[PDB]
């Protein structure tokens, strides 16, 4: 924590290194979830399945 009347950590636009407002307050890091897309590599139906 840094100062009492303001504790919600956030640095650029969306990181928001806090949660909302706990009684113990204080801020550690951010890891809600982070995963991306998928693609399929094929050689050709008439070549293989």
């Amino acid at each position: 924590k840094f100062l009492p009347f303001q504790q919600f950590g956030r640095d650029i636009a969306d990181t928001t290194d806090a949660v909302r407002d706990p009684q113990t307050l204080e801020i550690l890091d951010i890891t809600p979830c982070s995963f991306g897309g998928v693609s399929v590599i094929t050689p050709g139906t008439n070549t293989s399945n």
């Binding site: 840094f2 100062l3 303001q6 504790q7 919600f8 956030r10 640095d11 290194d17 806090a18």
Partner: protein, 50 residues
């Protein structure tokens, strides 16, 4: 019920300048190095206060 309180010598008013006084914290939200625009009431950057 009247009280007689007269002043024989009155000190003339003076002008007091101020640079960066009068900018409060309307919201309790912390801002870890972010630039935000405010729309509230503040004292001017350069002025004379009574």
């Amino acid at each position: 019920q009247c009280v007689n309180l007269t002043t024989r010598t009155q000190l003339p008013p003076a002008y007091t300048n101020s640079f960066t006084r009068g900018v409060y914290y309307p919201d309790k939200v912390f801002r870890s190095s972010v630039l935000h625009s405010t729309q509230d009431l503040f004292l001017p950057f350069f002025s004379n206060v009574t």
